[PDB]
């Protein structure tokens, strides 16, 4: 009955099939990345727990897992500055 009333349903259903399938792939590959990011974090923890052994600890024990370009790395810093300003500009608005 939906098709008879709304012939456009077949077109929209196909796109919803695409979106559900595509968003499932995107979720799978992000969980694969976050699995490695947590993997680096865990090793950076056991290594630097040696503060128990014996005491300042090292500064860069977390290792990069994604290889990106220099133009993106500069943009990553620029975006970070934006969110700090936005969080500060918003907070003062409700600060009265």
């Amino acid at each position: 009955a939906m098709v008879k009333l709304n012939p456009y349903a077949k077109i929209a259903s196909h796109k919803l099939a695409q979106v559900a399938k595509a968003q499932a792939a995107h979720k799978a590959q992000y969980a694969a990345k976050m699995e490695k990011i947590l993997a680096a974090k865990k090793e950076a923890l056991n290594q630097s727990v040696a503060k128990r052994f014996g005491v300042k600890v090292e500064n860069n024990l977390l290792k990069a897992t994604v290889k990106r370009t220099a133009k993106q790395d500069a943009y990553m810093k620029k975006y970070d500055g934006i969110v700090k300003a936005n969080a500060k500009k918003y907070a003062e608005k409700i600060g009265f």
Binding site: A91, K93, I94, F96
Partner: protein, 173 residues
């Protein structure tokens, strides 16, 4: 209880359309927040809804809902006799969390329903600024007490049997 940030402006002959009224209103939902907001305008600036435009009505969320803070709510309420101003302190982790305590406490000690209380302001006071006789006993760093007469806890309603077997015991816990 949720906190909202509401703004509006008045566009008529009496009011210039370049002065914005802001507020921080604690209401169960955003429809009540506007209802409280409009009353404060009409009862304080002769601004009516039919001659005003609302601009923003956004929820306000706690920045750190993991830090224990001492609050101080300044409020006025109406009794049988007259109208009074009260300042009650509360310990909680959210601004909305403490306000629900105030509403529930006022309706119990003073028997005052919610439609008699106007929350003037709410701030955060120091550890030594607390004056409530009961609440002052838990602000120190070395608080300690044994919870006696503990009722044994049930994991869920699944094991809640009407009749049990054997004897029943409390817990020194």
């Amino acid at each position: 209880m949720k906190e909202y940030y509401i703004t509006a402006r008045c566009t008529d002959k009496a009011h210039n359309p370049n002065e914005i009224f802001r507020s921080r209103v604690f209401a169960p939902n955003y429809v009540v927040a506007k209802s409280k907001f409009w009353m404060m305008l009409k009862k304080q600036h002769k601004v009516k809804k039919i001659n005003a435009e609302l601009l923003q009505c956004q929820p306000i969320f706690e920045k750190n809902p993991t830090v224990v803070k001492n609050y101080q709510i300044f409020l006025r309420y109406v009794s049988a006799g007259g109208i009074h101003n009260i300042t009650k302190q509360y310990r909680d982790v959210t601004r909305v969390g403490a306000v629900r305590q105030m509403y529930n406490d006022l309706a119990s000690q003073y028997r005052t329903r919610q439609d008699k209380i106007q929350l003037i302001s709410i701030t955060t006071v120091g550890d030594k600024a607390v004056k409530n006789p009961v609440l002052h006993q838990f602000v120190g760093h070395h608080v300690k007490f044994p919870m006696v007469h503990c009722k044994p806890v049930i994991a869920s309603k699944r094991f809640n049997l009407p009749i049990k077997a054997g004897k029943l015991t409390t817990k020194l816990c």
